[PDB]
């Protein structure tokens, strides 16, 4: 059958595996990457944000971006043939059509990649725990680039695809959401930093508990992929950390499962918190301390200090960060400390 | 041969927890810093950190929770001056000026430094390779940067990272407004180090778990397929490499477990090394990239970028941080 | 001053790392296990259990 | 007649310690928000 | 500090219930 013939070709052993998932992955991923490279090189953001964001305009690698569509577009798909662009490619770029282009094709790209992980794992004969782990980056992408702006007024308040643009997104979430005070980001931080810890401490331990399987000072040559023996001493590695740290791994399988668990769980937790922020459901305040501080002008914590910083961030960045609001702040209304 | 008996017990490998000569310094200092931290975090009175007679409450008994609680840095009036208990007229004065902060971090930094050395020591006693401590130098340098190096460059321990959750956030926000740490290539390498670390950790974890050789059934944990100290490897690297080598291309995958694990150590350690040096170099005010008003049109109008938006956010933190501590237009200290 | 202070602090730190690296290895090399653990003479295996 | 699909349940000491740690730390984190 | 009156009971149950669940599972394992 033609289906079986095509299946043979798609699953051919090549330098770059394709598979059925390749029909979805490769074009979408190529357009997402290409769309970003195109926009950050030529396309501007002058009509959407009032910002320059391409090499053609004078921006560097850190400042270039594919910016979000104007707030007036709402949650429009902004299709090229859509009622906004009306088939005009030039107008389409000027309206922010490339952002949705990247976001959407990038979304189905991530779907194609996770499918690719399933497909290859099925052909090889291994468990699909790599695909499962990849659910955490997806949950992050979906919550932040799709769900969060959908919860808000428009795509405008989604992250713009750029280095400095992301930094804007970071500081925005501090000033407006107090995202640092949210326990769901905290669990994410613990997962990322904890993942980096596990990654560093595992590689270091293994490398420093190696068996002597060679005569050379560089021990990389003393390994063979088809060997049946462990290359490092689990026993010696166990005693070391038992005396240094108090506890230690005794089971290799639980160790590498835990290395999956920590950063994946963290990202999923941070994803949940973003979903909340989409509705402005923030961990912004502690009511108990606001009651105290409002009644007692001598009560002060690092928490009340950070809120003053958020108030500063908001009032000072909003007019330019949200040009569609037409904010006009007279100098006398700006929150300022002494001298500065 | 009596002092020899003491030396043997200190360097003994049969202790549940290894002591060692580094531990001879580590154990008292860590206990000192820990005990003082627990007491101060709970029952310490407010502290005038900015040295402007504006005490900041940090303990639980004075209206804080776990999230807002902190041990507050020593007074700005103190600066880099050494401030032990016996330099104060009373414990009340010592507590008012942020005494506990210096006591803890100094005992801690000493203890932590000996902790690293202690890691080398046991590895030498066991016949291991000694570079695990080198990996621990990455977070240790990071602690040294925010607790010691940055206060030095700025001239006060009041600008050190507070011993608290919210206080930590305060440290980050003020830092960005003054150094633009986000637009600094060393923090960016740090982000790449911890994101990549978490990625590779999830990556290595998933590939090894996926290539686990069946030794168990469906009615029991797969972990019981491994026994502690067994000769055979619990997974198949050949199969694992076969998978990841097709996920991308084979020459983008590791077939060498030693080379793979080294990369697992190298990437996040080097990354954290840079972000450590980032704080350390920005301590002497070599700040992040400044592209404010870099783009200009033909007439001369400033065409804003995302950098200028970042600037507006930094302005907001700057003019509000320590609202009473500034008397002059330029923030230098 | 900013140039001179930052540059040499970077160098100073890495040289400390260089100290730790070359010192530990010197110890191991002089003792005879810088290239790994002898499979048929693992020190831990001859040591008693911690518990 | 007994049910042949029944199975014993286990939880070793290590899983207990890990589990208790997960709970105690989650408690320490979220308690502040409960009291608010 | 004027905190939530349910903060104490919600925190106590959040600790006790799942931790008890674990303890129960452990003791019946060592007895096996």
């Amino acid at each position: 059958g033609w289906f079986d013939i095509l299946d043979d070709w798609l699953k051919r052993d090549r330098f770059v595996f394709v598979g059925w998932s390749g029909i979805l992955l490769f074009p979408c991923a190529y357009l997402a990457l290409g769309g970003w490279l195109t926009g950050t090189t030529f396309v501007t953001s002058w009509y959407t944000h009032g910002l320059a964001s391409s090499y053609l305009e004078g921006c560097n690698f850190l400042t270039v971006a594919v910016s979000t569509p104007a707030n007036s577009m709402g949650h429009s798909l902004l299709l090229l043939w859509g009622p906004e662009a009306q088939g005009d490619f030039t107008r389409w770029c000027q309206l922010g059509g490339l952002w949705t282009f990247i976001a959407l094709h990038g979304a189905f790209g991530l779907i194609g990649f996770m499918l690719r992980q399933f497909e290859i794992a099925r052909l090889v004969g291994v468990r699909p725990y790599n695909a499962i782990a990849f659910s955490a980056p997806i949950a992050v992408f979906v919550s932040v680039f799709l769900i969060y702006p959908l919860g808000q007024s428009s795509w405008f308040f989604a992250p713009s695809f750029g280095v400095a643009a992301i930094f804007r997104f970071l500081l925005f979430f501090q000033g407006f959401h107090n995202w640092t005070l949210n326990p769901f980001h905290m669990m994410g931080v613990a997962g990322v930093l904890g993942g980096a810890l596990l990654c560093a401490i595992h590689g270091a331990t293994v490398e420093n508990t190696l068996f002597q399987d060679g005569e050379g000072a560089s021990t990389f040559r003393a390994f063979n992929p088809t060997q049946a023996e462990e290359t490092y001493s689990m026993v010696t590695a166990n005693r070391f950390w038992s005396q240094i740290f108090g506890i230690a791994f005794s089971n290799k399988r639980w160790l590498h499962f835990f290395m999956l668990f920590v950063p994946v769980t963290g990202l999923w937790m941070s994803a949940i918190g973003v979903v909340g922020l989409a509705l402005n459901l923030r961990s912004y305040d502690f009511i108990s301390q606001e009651i105290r501080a409002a009644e007692d002008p001598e009560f002060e914590t690092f928490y009340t200090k950070n809120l003053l910083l958020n108030e500063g961030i908001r009032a000072w960045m909003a007019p330019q960060d949200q040009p569609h609001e037409n904010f006009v702040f007279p100098e006398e209304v700006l929150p300022r400390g002494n001298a500065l | 041969n009596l002092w020899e008996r003491f030396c043997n017990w200190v360097t003994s490998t049969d202790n549940r927890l290894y002591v060692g000569w580094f531990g001879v310094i580590m154990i008292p200092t860590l206990l000192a810093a820990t005990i003082c931290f627990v007491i101060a975090f709970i029952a310490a009175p407010p502290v005038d950190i900015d040295g402007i007679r504006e005490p900041v409450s940090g303990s639980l008994l004075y209206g804080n929770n776990i999230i807002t609680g902190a041990v507050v840095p020593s007074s700005n009036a103190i600066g880099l001056h050494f401030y032990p208990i016996w330099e104060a007229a009373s414990l009340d004065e010592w507590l008012y000026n942020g005494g506990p902060y210096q006591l803890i971090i100094f005992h801690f930094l000493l203890g932590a430094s000996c902790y690293m050395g202690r890691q080398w020591e046991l590895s030498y006693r066991l016949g291991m390779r000694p570079w695990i401590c080198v990996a621990y130098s990455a977070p240790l340098a990071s602690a040294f940067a925010v607790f010691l190096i940055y206060p030095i460059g700025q001239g006060s321990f009041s600008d050190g990272m507070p011993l608290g959750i919210s206080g930590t956030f305060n440290f980050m926000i003020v830092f960005q407004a003054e150094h633009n740490i986000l637009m600094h290539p060393f923090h960016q390498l740090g982000v790449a180090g911890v994101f990549g670390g978490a990625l590779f950790c999830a990556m290595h974890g998933s590939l090894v778990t996926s290539s686990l050789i069946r030794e168990t059934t469906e009615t029991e944990s797969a972990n019981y397929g491994y026994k502690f100290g067994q000769e055979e490897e619990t997974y198949n690297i050949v199969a694992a490499h076969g998978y990841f080598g097709r996920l991308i291309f084979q020459y983008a995958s590791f077939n060498n477990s030693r080379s793979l694990h080294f990369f697992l150590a190298a990437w996040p350690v080097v990354g954290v090394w840079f972000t450590a040096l980032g704080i350390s170099t920005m301590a002497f005010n070599l700040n992040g990239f400044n592209f404010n008003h870099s783009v200009i049109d033909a007439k001369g109008n400033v065409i804003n970028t995302w950098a200028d938006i970042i600037n507006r956010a930094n302005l907001g933190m700057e003019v509000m941080h320590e609202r009473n501590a500034h008397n002059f237009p330029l923030d230098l200290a | 001053r900013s140039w001179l202070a930052t540059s040499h602090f970077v160098l100073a730190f890495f040289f400390l790392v260089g100290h730790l690296w070359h010192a530990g290895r010197a110890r191991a090399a002089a003792a005879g296990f810088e290239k790994g653990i002898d499979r048929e003479s693992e020190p831990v295996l001859s040591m008693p259990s911690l518990d | 007649e007994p049910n042949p699909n029944r199975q014993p349940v286990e939880l070793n000491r290590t899983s207990l310690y890990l589990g208790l740690l997960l709970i105690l730390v989650l408690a320490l984190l979220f308690s502040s928000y409960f009291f608010n | 500090m004027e905190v939530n009156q349910l903060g104490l009971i919600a925190t106590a149950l959040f600790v006790l219930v799942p931790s008890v669940f674990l303890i129960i599972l452990y003791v019946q394992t060592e007895s096996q």
Partner: peptide
């Protein structure tokens, strides 16, 4: 009462450390 709760949890964690180290499940070869 908030303080007592916070300290109690912290105390339990420290206690858990003691049992997870000195009264752990001994690894056997």
């Amino acid at each position: 009462m908030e303080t007592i709760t916070y300290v109690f949890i912290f105390a339990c964690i420290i206690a858990l450390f003691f049992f997870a180290i000195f009264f752990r499940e001994p690894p056997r070869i």
